[PDB]
């Protein structure tokens, strides 16, 4: 039936920069025009920017602009604010006697490019209560840093772990455009109580932060 | 006044059946197409099916098999049904005039189902403040929340009296098969031995909700 192939899945760009999406129709929509843009930010629901390919909602910033001309419809954002994070959607329709059929191209997600920011690094040991469950969780918390790209190792006894952890990291803020990030590394709780010191290490370009903790030491 | 309510999420066990109802007030029914869509935790949206203003209803090719999209004049609803799901069927439910072409466009607010293989409440410890935290500083605190299915858990600080400089983090999933999470908060450190912390965590899937104070560790 119809899809819409749209890209990039991604980019970043610093505010009061122009930023170009695009869409391809697999084939013809209806009336070569019933596309539109939507814009979706972190938790809400989708909400519809301009249709008719090029035809601006009332009330949405004039920033927004779509074009479109064969199969290939362009969404367009002239200055980008801060304010304009989100993923972004097309969706077409294609129509016939006997056919209705819609698409959404898979999204753009726009991250806002800052100055680059070094996190705040806190090491959480694992609490006597869930060490009475058998396994124990050490949170390592890069808070506030920019850019996400972050190298995150642990290290028990100076030996390097591998395949024993797994981050998360969030949305990009509201407030300083930065992220946060989780590194959890999971244990029996009998190698906890084998090996003393405990360290995550952090790396970003040419530093590295690392914060530890002796287990029992206060 | 123009509004659409989707109705009739919850809970399904894989091989169930979803029946979702989406009520339109300020307008008939029977005067537009209407769609239904859906959007699985953190992925695109996708277009179910169709119902033309005549009636006609056009699904998704991979929708056709198990599902229905019907229409009641009577009570102004169209009707989403799709049965024998499987996981990947965990969505946010959306019935929408999508507006591609026309100025009129209009989405209920979205009605979560969630097929579940397993029930499993969550267990809460804490992070708890390092006793390293700067004096007259900032100090990062919070709740780790392991071993819960399905998804979501929602996390609040006080009861939501505390929202500045929290994070709570989207969950893993985990190499058992369950979800963790933390949720983190910076404070003032010179609160720490003031201000009381406690994070609230809800999982209405195994109706549980923890609520857990969370204080400097004793030396
Ligand atoms: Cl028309
Ligand atoms: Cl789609």
């Known amino acids: 039936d119809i899809q819409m192939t749209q890209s990039p899945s991604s980019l970043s760009a610093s505010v009061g920069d122009r930023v170009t999406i695009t869409c391809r129709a697999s084939?013809?929509?209806?009336?070569?025009?019933?596309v539109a843009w939507y814009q979706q930010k972190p938790g809400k629901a989708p909400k519809r920017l301009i249709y008719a390919i090029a035809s601006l909602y009332s009330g949405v910033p004039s920033r927004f602009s779509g074009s479109g001309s064969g199969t290939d419809f362009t969404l367009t954002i002239s200055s980008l604010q801060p304010e304009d994070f989100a993923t972004y959607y097309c969706?077409?329709?294609?129509?016939?006697?006997?056919?209705?059929?819609?698409?959404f191209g898979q999204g753009t997600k726009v991250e806002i490019k800052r100055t680059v920011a070094a996190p705040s690094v806190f090491i959480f040991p694992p609490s006597d209560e869930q060490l009475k469950s058998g396994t124990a969780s050490v949170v390592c918390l890069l808070n506030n840093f920019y850019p996400r790209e972050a190298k995150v190792s642990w290290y028990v006894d100076n030996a390097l772990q591998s395949g024993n952890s797994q981050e998360s990291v969030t949305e990009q803020d509201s407030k300083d455009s930065t992220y946060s990030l989780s590194s959890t590394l999971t244990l029996s709780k009998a190698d906890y109580e084998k090996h003393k010191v405990y360290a995550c290490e952090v790396t970003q370009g040419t530093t590295s932060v690392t914060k530890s903790f002796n287990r029992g030491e206060c | 006044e123009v509004q659409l309510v989707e109705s009739g999420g919850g809970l399904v066990q894989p091989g169930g059946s979803l029946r979702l109802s989406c009520t339109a007030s300020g307008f008939s029914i029977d005067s537009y197409g209407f769609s239904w869509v859906r959007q699985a935790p953190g992925k695109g949206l996708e277009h179910i099916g169709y119902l033309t203003a005549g009636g006609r209803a056009f699904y998704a090719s991979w929708a056709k098999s198990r599902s229905t999209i019907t229409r009641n004049t009577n009570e102004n609803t169209v009707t989403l049904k799709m049965n024998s799901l499987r996981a990947e069927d965990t969505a946010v439910y959306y019935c929408?005039?999508?507006?591609?072409?026309?100025?009129?466009?209009?989405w209920g607010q979205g009605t979560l189902v969630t097929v579940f293989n397993q029930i499993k409440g969550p267990s809460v410890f804490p992070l708890a403040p390092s006793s390293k935290s700067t004096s007259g500083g900032t100090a990062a605190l919070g709740c780790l929340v392991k071993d819960y299915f399905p998804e979501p858990v929602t996390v609040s600080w006080n009861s939501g009296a505390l929202t500045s400089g929290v994070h709570t983090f989207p969950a893993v999933l985990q190499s058992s098969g369950l979800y963790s999470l933390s949720s983190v908060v910076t404070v003032p450190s010179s609160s720490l031995g003031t201000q009381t912390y406690i994070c609230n965590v809800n999982h209405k899937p195994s109706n549980t909700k923890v609520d857990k104070k969370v204080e400097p560790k004793s030396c």
């Open positions: 929408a005039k999508l507006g591609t072409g026309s100025r009129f466009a209009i």
């Open positions: 084939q013809s929509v209806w009336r070569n025009k019933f």
């Open positions: 969706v077409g329709h294609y129509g016939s006697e006997n056919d209705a059929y819609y698409a």
